[PDB]
Structure formats: structure tokens, C-alpha cells
């Protein structure tokens, strides 16, 4: 009765999971596009930094 | 999703035959070797038999080698495995596995306590 | 009995598969079709660390982006600084295989793990001067894979019998186990506002698990293979994971499904470990066939590729002023990168 | 004419030899892994002796040759012990390298606990100073010199002569050849352990020579290249004083195999694929 | 800029103590030798070596230190682990040897046997790395064979076709079936490790006792064995 009892885990996991709020996909994405584009110029692999300003160089 | 649906098999009689189909769905079939575990009622997992990615080699259990066919078509994605010259004392649970990995021959998929890359099996039951 | 049950939640994932199929409207890379490309990305080894013995299985950086703890297979666990070279401190550890480690955020403390199924934490005050084993956590069966810091106080760990835990460490006992998983839990990735975290098992399905109730939210079921390492994008609202199939993903928690998968036909080698950037654009991928790619995480491109080490390149990090991007290999070196 | 036609065969011999010489050596500063193992120190030893050589040996004898005459007449004296030197670098390396290989191929467990690189640098260093006792100092004090237009034949004498020729070359391939033939023997037991697992199992295949070749042209290329390179010359060397026995020109013609021999030192112990991978990233060719 | 003058001395101060004593701890290190102790648990994989310094037992693993001819030797026996292996296998990439230990007594273990010696065999990380096999248990063979029925061809339908190999010299005092079981089975475990046939690594097969010295200088000699291919490898002699 071992494989019925996490069968019926899986249900009511199953069951708490399907009842869920879902956003569509394009407005996740123009949110994501939005915070790439906000935050593009403070990262210092995307876009070059001067040897004076870099701590390695 | 990776998903296996094993499909035929039964009560059936000693000397007949039967074929088991494998409906592999939730991943490109051509890419993993595949192969074949059956559980005996009170006993542990045995590998039955394997196939590659071209389905060129092909090795058996030696018990029971010569009488089984094991077939895959990659354009009808399914694992066809023909039974024929029955035995009672191979009654058991077939359980279709599939390796872990690509473009490999490494397979560690004889274990019982919870192998997610397998189908749920089917029951196949030989009364003389 | 178990065959109502099986039906049951056959059902139950059709309609989750239902409402994940309603929800799909478009994709992402015909949405970022008007973007600009990012381009020939090249990045050069500004320093190299020496002197680990054995291969390096697990790094993570400081919060001050300044010294990374690095772990090996010889037994030393070895905090680094990354300006000057220096080692500020050389560890040795009881077991000898090691397969995480962690760093504080305040720096005071390093925790270890590895196939003895137990987390060391190490404090680093010294008011004698040397450093001494704060705690031993022996609450897990199979291995520990990946341990990260929640706070000083708290510690979530993930073992290798399909269960994660939260220790608290003055206690020193499990606060909230999770044991959602059927697969081995093979790392963590904590979320910035650190309430929520995703782990990837190898039963390909990465879950999504809240802290403080103490279940899981969310289910993935989009790879094909064992789902090795998985990190949050840096909004907290999506998260890319690599697999042993070729294959980053990149999942949504709303939409609850992959956005963008990132395949290229001529690489068939495993992923080993993945970190996002600073701003999010470049995801950085380490690769089994000895090199990392950048991935343009919006057009599903490589970049660039960081062909610098000589075995396989085993974990990978990131500063979180996003300065500079440290790999660690099995040929014992720490490749820092800008 | 004829000088034509020799001034293009030393020029390209002078030139591969610079260029092996420099990619082992730039090879080695470039990359760490190539300098990690304790091995590949003494090929560092012979990649530097080989340059000394054809930096310092080969042109000015060259340029001799083409003229016919001698151009500065006291550089001679010094030419002569550089020479010496230069050479007998060379194959008490070759002779280090061949020690290297036994040890380590004798005593696989004594190897890693007794090279520690302070033996190694204890072997190169007891070879270039066997070479710079053997060379700067008899030359100088002139005692070959004195067997009893200007031209740099020095006639050597009978005493330097055989006893240089014994310190040079006739030890270090007495040690080469017990070397080689004893990893030769281990190398046959191998190969016949290999065959006897390979023979049962393609006997339980079917119930249902090749390896022997490349370890004896291995061992047949070193040996047979440094042995037919240089002993023409010191068995010259050696009959030359005692004594028609020799002509000029002969004589002249295996000095420059014996000079040929340090191009063909690198391509030879250089077969590693960590050497290829460095030569195709350094020249950039591939 | 005094100051960082100063704590710039300090840190290198530090930096030349730990470099030291790594070191010393790398001398420690390359004198050791690890080796991977993996077999069934139906064998007695822990009855194998007698000649062990020390038993010594961490939580989830065993760790044995014993030295032949003063060369150090570690030997690592997995513990309480998950039955799923493919992860923590990595691991042990670094070792010299993998000493695999299989009973022969139970004759549907032998399968499984085969099954994970094929696995470790054509695994990509473990190419590198040698195997030395033990067919534990040749005593309960022996005492086995004379039971009336034979299991081995039952299991298998080869070995009613097979000889004993003309390479293999038996020990006195023993049955020619017993000999051809034995010989049958270490030609399985040979033609598994040949069918690969990368040259890398080879297999070493032994046939041990239930009670028995000698196995901890046959693991010294097949390190010697190791090493030595692994450098006529290395100048590309082989
Ligand atoms: C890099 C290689 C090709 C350089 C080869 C240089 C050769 C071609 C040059 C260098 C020295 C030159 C010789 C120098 C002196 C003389 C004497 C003169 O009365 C006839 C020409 C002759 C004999 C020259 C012929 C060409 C020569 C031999
Ligand atoms: C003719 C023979 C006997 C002369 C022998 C001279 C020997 C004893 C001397 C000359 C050069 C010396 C070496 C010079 C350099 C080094 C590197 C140093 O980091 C360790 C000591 C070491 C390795 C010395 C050891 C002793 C040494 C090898
Ligand atoms: C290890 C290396 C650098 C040692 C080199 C030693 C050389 C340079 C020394 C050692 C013996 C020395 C010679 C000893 C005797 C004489 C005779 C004297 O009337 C002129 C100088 C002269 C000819 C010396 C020249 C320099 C010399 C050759
Ligand atoms: C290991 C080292 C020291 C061995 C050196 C051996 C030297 C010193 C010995 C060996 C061979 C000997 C030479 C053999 C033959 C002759 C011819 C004879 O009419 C005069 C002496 C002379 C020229 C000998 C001089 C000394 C000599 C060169
Ligand atoms: C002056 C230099 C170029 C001379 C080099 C001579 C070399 C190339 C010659 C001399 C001896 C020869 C070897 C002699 C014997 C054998 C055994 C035969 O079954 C395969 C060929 C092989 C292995 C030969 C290969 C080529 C060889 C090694
Ligand atoms: C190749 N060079 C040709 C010119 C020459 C002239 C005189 C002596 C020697 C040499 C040798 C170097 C050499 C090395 C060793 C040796 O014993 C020697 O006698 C000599
Ligand atoms: C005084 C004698 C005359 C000159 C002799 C110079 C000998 C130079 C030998 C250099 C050997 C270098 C070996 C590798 C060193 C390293 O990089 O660790
Ligand atoms: C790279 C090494 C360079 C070596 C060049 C050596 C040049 C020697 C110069 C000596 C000139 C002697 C001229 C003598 C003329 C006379 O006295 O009549
Ligand atoms: C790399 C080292 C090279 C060293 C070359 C040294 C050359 C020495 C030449 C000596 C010339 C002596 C001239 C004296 C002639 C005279 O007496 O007038």
C-alpha cells in the first residue's frame, strides 16, 4: 500500500498544481526584454569598461 | 516530458507469441540506445535485452537468447518486442528503459528504487 | 487501486498540458526578431590561479565580489583573492571528496559537502588564528551535491536520495525537508529575494519550492535528460537550466513553461554548469568538450566561446557586479575571464 | 657552380635547426603543462644545446667553407672549445634522456619518490659541466693543440684525442645501448601479455605483431639515427692522430653529419601530441 | 599608500606559509596512491585484502591505508550510497585503479556483475582508468560443481560449446570442469573488456580465495603493471 499512498501524493500534488494563476508568454517576455534593456549599459561583460575603471586592469 | 507506454501482453499460453510495443514520446528517439528490464513477482530487475542508436548491434540475456526480436523503427518512433516459444517460469513485468544519455553506451537503469526514464510496464502472465 | 490513481493523474497532466498549450500565444525569438544582435563577444584570461593537486569540482564567489572559495579533490578547500592572487586561507578537510561549497554573505563562514553525506561548516573568525570545524551536519542519506547559504543562520543543502533540507545551524537539526523529487537532486539555485528556490534532479524536472511553506509550487518536465546545473535569472521571475542532452532551457514561473531552448547541432556534449550574466543578456554555459559558449540569451546565439582550459570545464561563476566570470576545470586551474 | 649548390644545403640545414630549436624552446615558455612534468626538462637541456650549436657552431664553419679561406684567425681557439663543448652537450643530454627513460620505465614507483626536479637539475647541471670541463679548459691551455694563409686545423693530439673521444661518445652509447635494450625486454613481456588476453579472447569470439613493429621502430629510429650520425666521426676522430688514412674534404663532410644530427634531435623527441598541439598553436599553421 | 604597503606585505607573508605547506601536502599527495573498491554485495568484497594497516570507517564511506614496499596505498569501499551511480562515479576519475569484485558462487548475480563491469568498462570518464577483477569465492565453485546439476549452462547456452583455453595452465589437484567454469567466466569478463579495444586500459583477472594473503601484493604488482604500460604509453613505445 506503499505505491498507492504516493500515488495519491502525486493527485494532490497534481491537483494543487493545476490550480495555478498562468500570465501569458508575451507579456513575460516584454518583461523580460524591459529588464535586459533597463539594466544593458551597468554590465561590464556586455559592454566594454576601460582599463583605468577595471579593477583587473 | 520523457514518456513511455508499453502496450500488449496478458495471460497467455506457453509456445505462443506475443508482441510487446514501446510508444516513446517526449524526446528524439534516434539519439538514445534503449533497451528492455523485466521484474519477476519476488525477485529483482533483470536486463532482458538492448539496442543502439542505429539498431546495428544487439546483444540478449543469455537464458533466454534466440527467442526474442527486438525491433525499433525511429520514423514510427516505437520498440517493438516479438515473444515467441513461451515459458512458464518467465512470467514477469516488462518495464521498456531508456539510457540517460545521448550518443553513448553507457546504461545504469537496472535500479528499483524509483528509475524515472522508464515506462509503468505490462503485465504478462503465462498459465500452463 | 493504482490504476484509477495513474488515470487520475494522466488526466490531471493533460490538463496541466492543456492549459500550458492555451497559454503559449507566440514565442520569444519571433517577438525579439527587431533586436539588436550582441555580436563577437571576446573575453581574456586576466588572471590564472594555481597550485590545486587534484581537479577543481566546485567554486562559488563573495558578495563583495573579492575572494572565491575553491574546492578540490585533494582535500583543500582553498579561499582565494582574486586581485592579487594571494590565497588568504587553505582549508583541510576530513574527507578528501568534495562536491560543493559554499560562501557566506557576510563572509564569516565556508560550508563543504561531498560523498561522506555531511556539511561542513567552517568559521572563519580565528580568534586563536586558525580555522577550525564550526559544525558537522549528518541528517542525509545519499551524498551531498550542492549547498548554498540562505543567510549566517539558516542553510538549504541538496542530497543525493531526492531530498533537500533546511538546516538551521545553532539548532543543528532539519527545519523543512522537501521530497517532491524522484530523481537525484544535482544542484540548487536560490532565489535574490531568497524565499523561493528551483532545483534540477535527474528525473528531468526542475521544481520550484517555496521556503517557508515548505512545498513545491511549480513543476518543469521540459528537458530530456539529467538536469546537472539550473540558475535564476537575475529578476527572479525565470531560470535557465543545462542538460547531459546538448540543450539549455530557459523556463518562466508564470507562464509555467520553457520560453527558448538553446541547442547547436556540432556541440552533442553535456552542460555542466550555467550562470547567467549581471543584466541577463549573455547566459554563460560550461560545456564538456573543454570550452564555455555565450549564449545570447534573447536570440538564442553563441556569442563567443571561452576555449582557455584543458579538461573539462566543471563549474562556473559569476561576480554579482558582473566584473568578471571565474572557471573552474578538472585540469586543476581557475581560469578568471573578462 | 658547385659552391652555389653548397651554400644552399648548409644555409637550409642552418635554418632548420634554428627553427626546431626555437619552436621546442618557445613551445616550453609558453605553456605550462609542457614545463609541469619533470621529464621534459632535459629535452629543454637538448633544445638548448642544439641552439647553441646552430647559433654558434655551424655559421662561422659555413661561411669557412664557402670562402675556403678562415676570416678572423683568433677566434679559432675559442671556435674549437665551443665546439667541443656544444657537441658534447648534446649527447651527454642524449644520454641523460635515455637514463630518464629507464629509470622511469624500470622503477614506475622510485620514479615519482626519487625525481624530485632537484635530481633533475642535478643530472643537467653534472652534464654541462662535465661538457665545459671537457671543452674550455684543455682548448685554452692548448694542450691538443701542440701535437709536436691561415687556417683553423688543429691538429689534435693523440692523448685528447682518445680520451675526449672516450668522455664523448663511446660511454654514452655503451649506456644507451644497456638502455635501450633493457626497455626493449620489458617492452616484448608487455606486448606478449597484451597478445596472450587479446588470443583468448578472439578464441572465445570465434568459439561462438603490429604493436611488437611500432615498439622496434621506436627504438630501432633513435638508436639508429644518433649511433649512424655520429660514429663515422669518432671512429675517424680516434684513427686520425694514431696515423693514406683520411682526405680534408672527407673528414669535412662527416663533421657536417655529425652537425646534420642536431636537426634531426628535436623532430625525433618531439613525437609527444602536447608538442604537436604547441607547434600548431605557436607556428599558427593549423 | 603606505598602509596598502603594508597589508600588501602581510598578505604575502601568508601567501609563502600556505605555499609552503601545500607543498608539503603535494610530496604527500604524489606519494599516494588511490584505488577504487567496487563489487556486489552478495561478494565479500570486504574479506579481500588481510593485509590492511588500518579499517578505518567515515559516515557514508570506508577509507584503508596500506603500504607494500613503502608505497602508500588508499582504497576507498563505497557505503551507504543510493542505488543510482552515473553521478558520483565522476569522482573517482583520479584513481590509478578500479579493483571490481564479483562473486561467482550465485550464478544470477554473475549477469548483473556483467552488466555494471560493461557499464564501468564503456563509461567516458572511466577510459582512463585501469581494472583489476577478483572471481571471489573458487572454493564454493569447486564444492559447487558436484551438486548434480550444473547452473552456468542453464544461464547460459554458450558454455555447452566451449573448451578450456590451451594458454591456461590449471592448478594441481583440480576437477578439468571446475577449471573450465572458472576459465569460461573470466573469458565473459575478457571478452567484454576487449570488444571496447581503445589500448588505454586493460583488465587485470585473478582468481582470489575466501581466505587469502596474497592479494594485497597482486594489487602492488598490477600497479606495477599499470604504471609501466601507462609510461610505454606516454613515450609512445606501445
Ligand atoms: C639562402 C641560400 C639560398 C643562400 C645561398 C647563397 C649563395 C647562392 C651565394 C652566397 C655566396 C655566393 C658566392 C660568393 C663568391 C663567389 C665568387 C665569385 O667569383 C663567383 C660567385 C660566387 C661563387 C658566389 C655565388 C653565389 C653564392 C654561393
Ligand atoms: C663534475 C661534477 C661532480 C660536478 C658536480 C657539481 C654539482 C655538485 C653542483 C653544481 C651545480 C649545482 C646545482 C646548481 C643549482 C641547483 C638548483 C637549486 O634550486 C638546488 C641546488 C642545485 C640543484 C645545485 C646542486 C649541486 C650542483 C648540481
Ligand atoms: C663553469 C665555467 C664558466 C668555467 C669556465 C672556465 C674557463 C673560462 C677558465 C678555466 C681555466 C682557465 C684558463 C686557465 C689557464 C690559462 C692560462 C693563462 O696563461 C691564460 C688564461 C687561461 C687560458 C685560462 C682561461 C680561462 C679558463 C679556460
Ligand atoms: C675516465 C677517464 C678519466 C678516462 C681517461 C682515459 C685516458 C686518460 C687514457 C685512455 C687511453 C689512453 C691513451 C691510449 C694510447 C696512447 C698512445 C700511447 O703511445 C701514448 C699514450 C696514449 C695517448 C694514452 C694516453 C692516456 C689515455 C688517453
Ligand atoms: C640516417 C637516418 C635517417 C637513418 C634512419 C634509419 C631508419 C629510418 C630505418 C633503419 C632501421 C629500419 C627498421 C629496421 C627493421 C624494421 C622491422 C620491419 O618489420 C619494419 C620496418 C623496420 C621497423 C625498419 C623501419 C625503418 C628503420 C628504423
Ligand atoms: C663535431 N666537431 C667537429 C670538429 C672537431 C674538431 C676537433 C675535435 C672535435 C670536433 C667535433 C666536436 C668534438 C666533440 C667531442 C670530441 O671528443 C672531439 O674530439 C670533438
Ligand atoms: C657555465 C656553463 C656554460 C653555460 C651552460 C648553460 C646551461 C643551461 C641549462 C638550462 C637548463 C634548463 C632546464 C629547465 C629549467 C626550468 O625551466 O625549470
Ligand atoms: C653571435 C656571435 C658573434 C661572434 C663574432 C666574432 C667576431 C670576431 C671579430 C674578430 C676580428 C679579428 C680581426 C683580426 C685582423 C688582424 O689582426 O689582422
Ligand atoms: C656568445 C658568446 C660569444 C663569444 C665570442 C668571443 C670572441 C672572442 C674573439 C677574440 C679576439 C681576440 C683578438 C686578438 C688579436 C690580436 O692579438 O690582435
Redesign the interface.
Known amino acids: 500500500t506503499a505505491?498507492?499512498a504516493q500515488?495519491?501524493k502525486?493527485?494532490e500534488?497534481?491537483?494543487?498544481?493545476?490550480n495555478?494563476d498562468?500570465?501569458?508568454?508575451?507579456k513575460?517576455?516584454?518583461?523580460?526584454?524591459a529588464?535586459?534593456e533597463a539594466?544593458?549599459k551597468?554590465?561590464?561583460?556586455?559592454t566594454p569598461?576601460p582599463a583605468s575603471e577595471?579593477?583587473?586592469? | 516530458?520523457?514518456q513511455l507506454q508499453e502496450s500488449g501482453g496478458g495471460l497467455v499460453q506457453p509456445g505462443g507469441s506475443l508482441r510487446l510495443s514501446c510508444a516513446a514520446s517526449?524526446?528524439?528517439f534516434s539519439?538514445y540506445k534503449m533497451n528492455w528490464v523485466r521484474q519477476a513477482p519476488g525477485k529483482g530487475l533483470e536486463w532482458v535485452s538492448d539496442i543502439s542508436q542505429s539498431g546495428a548491434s544487439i546483444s540478449y540475456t543469455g537464458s533466454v537468447k534466440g527467442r526474442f526480436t527486438i525491433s525499433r523503427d525511429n520514423a514510427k518512433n516505437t520498440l517493438y518486442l516479438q515473444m515467441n516459444s513461451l515459458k512458464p517460469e518467465d512470467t514477469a513485468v516488462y518495464y521498456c528503459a531508456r539510457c540517460?544519455?545521448?550518443?553513448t553506451r553507457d546504461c545504469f537503469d537496472v535500479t528499483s528504487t524509483?528509475y524515472?526514464?522508464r515506462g509503468?510496464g505490462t503485465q504478462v502472465t503465462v498459465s500452463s | 487501486?493504482?490504476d484509477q490513481?495513474?488515470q487520475?493523474?494522466e488526466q490531471?497532466?493533460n490538463?496541466?498540458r492543456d492549459?500550458r498549450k492555451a497559454?503559449?500565444?507566440?514565442?520569444?525569438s519571433q517577438?525579439?526578431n527587431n533586436?539588436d544582435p550582441?555580436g563577437r563577444?571576446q573575453?581574456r584570461t586576466?588572471?590564472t590561479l594555481r597550485?590545486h593537486?587534484?581537479?577543481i569540482?566546485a567554486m562559488h564567489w563573495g558578495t563583495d565580489s573579492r575572494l572565491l572559495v575553491s574546492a578540490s579533490?585533494?582535500g583543500?578547500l582553498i579561499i582565494w583573492?582574486?586581485?592579487?592572487t594571494?590565497?588568504?586561507?587553505?582549508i583541510?578537510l576530513?574527507?578528501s571528496?568534495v562536491?560543493t561549497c559554499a560562501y557566506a554573505p557576510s563572509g564569516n563562514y565556508v560550508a563543504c559537502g561531498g560523498?561522506?553525506?555531511?556539511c561542513s561548516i567552517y568559521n572563519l573568525k580565528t580568534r586563536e588564528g586558525n580555522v577550525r570545524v564550526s559544525r558537522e551536519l549528518?541528517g542525509h542519506?545519499?551524498?551531498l551535491?550542492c549547498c548554498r547559504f540562505l543567510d549566517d543562520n539558516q542553510i538549504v543543502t541538496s542530497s543525493?536520495?531526492?531530498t533537500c533540507a533546511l538546516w538551521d545551524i545553532e539548532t543543528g537539526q532539519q527545519t523543512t525537508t522537501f521530497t517532491?523529487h524522484?530523481?537525484?537532486v544535482?544542484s540548487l539555485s536560490l532565489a535574490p529575494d531568497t524565499r523561493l528556490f528551483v532545483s534540477g534532479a535527474?528525473?528531468?524536472s526542475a521544481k520550484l519550492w517555496d521556503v517557508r511553506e515548505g512545498?513545491?509550487?511549480?513543476?518543469f518536465?521540459?528537458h530530456?535528460?539529467?538536469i546537472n546545473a539550473i540558475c535564476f535569472?537575475?529578476?527572479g521571475?525565470?531560470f535557465a537550466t543545462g542538460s547531459?542532452?546538448?540543450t539549455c532551457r530557459l523556463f518562466?514561473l508564470?507562464?509555467?513553461?520553457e520560453?527558448m531552448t538553446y541547442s547547436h547541432d556540432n556541440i552533442?556534449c553535456?552542460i555542466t554548469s550555467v550562470s547567467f550574466?549581471?543584466?541577463?543578456?549573455?547566459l554563460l554555459a560550461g560545456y564538456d568538450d573543454f570550452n564555455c559558449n555565450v549564449w545570447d540569451?534573447?536570440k538564442a546565439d553563441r556569442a563567443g566561446v571561452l576555449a582557455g582550459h584543458?579538461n573539462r570545464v566543471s563549474c562556473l561563476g559569476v561576480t554579482d557586479?558582473?566584473?568578471?566570470?571565474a572557471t573552474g576545470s578538472?585540469?586543476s586551474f581557475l581560469k578568471?575571464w573578462? | 657552380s658547385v659552391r652555389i649548390l653548397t651554400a644552399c644545403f648548409l644555409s637550409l640545414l642552418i635554418l632548420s635547426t634554428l627553427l626546431g630549436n626555437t619552436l621546442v624552446c618557445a613551445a616550453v615558455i609558453r605553456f605550462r603543462?609542457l614545463r609541469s612534468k619533470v621529464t621534459n626538462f632535459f629535452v629543454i637541456s637538448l633544445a638548448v644545446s642544439d641552439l647553441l650549436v646552430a647559433v654558434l657552431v655551424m655559421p662561422w664553419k659555413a661561411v669557412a667553407e664557402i670562402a675556403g679561406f678562415w676570416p678572423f684567425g683568433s677566434f679559432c681557439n675559442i671556435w674549437v672549445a665551443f665546439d667541443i663543448m656544444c657537441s658534447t652537450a648534446s649527447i651527454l643530454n642524449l644520454c641523460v634522456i635515455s637514463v630518464d627513460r629507464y629509470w622511469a620505465i624500470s622503477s614506475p614507483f622510485r620514479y615519482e619518490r626519487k625525481m624530485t626536479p632537484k635530481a633533475a637539475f642535478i643530472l643537467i647541471s653534472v652534464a654541462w659541466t662535465l661538457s665545459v670541463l671537457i671543452s674550455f679548459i684543455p682548448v685554452q691551455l692548448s694542450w691538443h693543440k701542440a701535437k709536436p694563409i691561415d687556417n683553423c686545423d688543429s691538429s689534435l693530439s693523440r692523448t685528447y684525442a682518445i680520451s675526449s673521444s672516450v668522455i664523448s661518445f663511446y660511454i654514452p652509447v655503451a649506456i644507451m645501448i644497456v638502455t635501450y635494450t633493457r626497455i626493449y625486454r620489458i617492452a616484448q613481456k608487455q606486448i606478449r601479455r597484451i597478445a596472450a588476453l587479446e588470443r583468448a579472447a578472439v578464441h572465445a569470439k570465434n568459439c561462438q605483431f603490429k604493436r611488437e613493429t611500432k615498439v622496434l621502430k621506436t627504438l630501432s629510429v633513435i638508436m639508429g639515427v644518433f649511433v649512424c650520425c655520429w660514429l663515422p666521426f669518432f671512429i675517424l676522430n680516434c684513427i686520425l692522430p694514431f696515423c693514406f688514412c683520411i682526405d680534408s674534404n672527407t673528414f669535412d663532410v662527416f663533421v657536417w653529419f655529425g652537425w646534420a644530427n642536431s636537426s634531426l634531435n628535436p623532430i625525433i623527441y618531439a613525437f609527444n601530441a602536447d608538442f604537436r598541439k604547441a607547434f600548431s598553436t605557436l607556428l599558427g599553421c593549423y | 599608500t603606505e598602509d596598502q604597503r603594508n597589508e600588501?606585505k602581510a598578505?604575502?607573508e601568508?601567501?609563502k606559509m600556505?605555499?609552503k605547506?601545500?607543498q608539503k601536502?603535494?610530496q604527500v599527495?604524489r606519494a599516494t596512491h588511490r584505488l577504487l573498491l567496487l563489487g556486489a554485495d552478495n561478494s565479500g568484497k570486504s574479506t579481500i585484502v588481510k593485509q590492511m594497516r588500518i579499517y578505518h570507517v567515515?559516515?557514508?564511506?570506508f577509507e584503508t591505508k596500506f603500504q607494500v614496499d613503502k608505497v602508500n596505498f588508499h582504497m576507498?569501499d563505497?557505503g551507504?550510497?543510493?542505488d543510482?551511480r552515473?553521478?558520483?562515479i565522476q569522482?573517482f576519475?583520479?584513481v590509478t585503479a578500479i579493483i571490481f569484485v564479483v562473486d561467482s558462487s550465485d550464478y544470477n548475480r554473475l549477469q548483473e556483475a556483467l552488466n555494471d563491469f560493461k557499464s564501468i568498462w564503456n563509461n567516458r570518464w572511466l577510459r582512463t582508468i585501469s581494472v583489476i577483477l577478483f572471481l571471489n569465492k573458487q572454493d564454493l565453485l569447486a564444492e559447487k560443481v558436484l551438486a548434480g546439476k550444473s547452473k552456468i549452462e542453464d544461464y547460459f547456452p554458450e558454455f555447452a560449446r566451449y573448451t578450456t583455453p590451451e594458454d591456461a595452465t590449471p592448478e594441481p589437484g583440480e576437477d578439468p570442469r571446475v577449471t573450465r567454469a572458472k576459465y569460461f567466466i573470466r573469458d565473459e569478463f575478457l571478452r567484454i573488456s576487449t570488444a571496447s579495444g581503445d589500448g588505454r586500459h586493460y583488465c587485470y583477472p585473478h582468481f582470489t580465495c575466501s581466505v587469502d594473503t596474497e592479494n594485497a601484493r597482486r594489487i602492488f604488482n598490477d600497479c606495477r603493471d599499470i604504471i609501466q604500460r601507462m609510461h610505454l604509453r606516454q613515450y609512445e613505445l606501445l
Request: aromatic share 8%.
Open positions: 505505491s498507492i500515488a495519491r502525486l493527485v500534488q497534481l491537483k494543487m498544481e493545476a495555478i498562468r500570465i501569458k508568454v508575451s513575460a517576455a516584454a518583461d523580460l526584454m529588464y535586459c539594466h544593458a551597468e554590465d561590464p561583460l556586455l569598461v577595471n579593477p583587473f586592469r | 516530458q520523457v517526449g524526446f528524439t539519439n540517460p544519455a545521448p550518443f524509483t524515472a526514464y509503468q | 487501486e493504482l490513481l495513474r487520475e493523474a490531471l497532466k490538463q496541466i492549459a497559454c503559449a500565444d507566440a514565442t520569444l517577438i525579439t533586436i550582441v563577444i573575453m586576466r588572471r597550485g593537486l587534484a581537479k569540482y579533490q585533494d583543500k583573492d582574486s586581485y592579487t594571494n590565497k588568504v586561507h587553505a583541510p576530513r574527507s571528496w562536491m560523498l561522506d553525506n555531511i549528518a542519506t545519499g551524498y551535491s543525493g536520495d531526492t517532491g524522484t530523481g537525484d544535482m535527474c528525473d528531468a512545498m513545491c509550487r511549480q513543476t518536465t521540459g530530456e535528460s539529467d535569472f537575475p529578476n521571475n525565470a547531459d542532452d546538448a518562466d508564470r507562464a509555467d513553461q520560453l552533442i553535456g550574466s549581471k543584466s541577463g543578456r549573455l540569451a534573447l584543458d557586479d558582473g566584473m568578471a566570470v578538472w585540469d578568471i573578462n | 603543462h | 600588501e598578505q604575502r601568508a601567501n600556505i605555499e605547506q601545500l601536502d603535494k599527495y567515515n559516515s557514508g564511506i576507498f563505497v551507504a550510497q543510493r543510482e552515473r553521478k558520483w569522482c576519475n583520479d
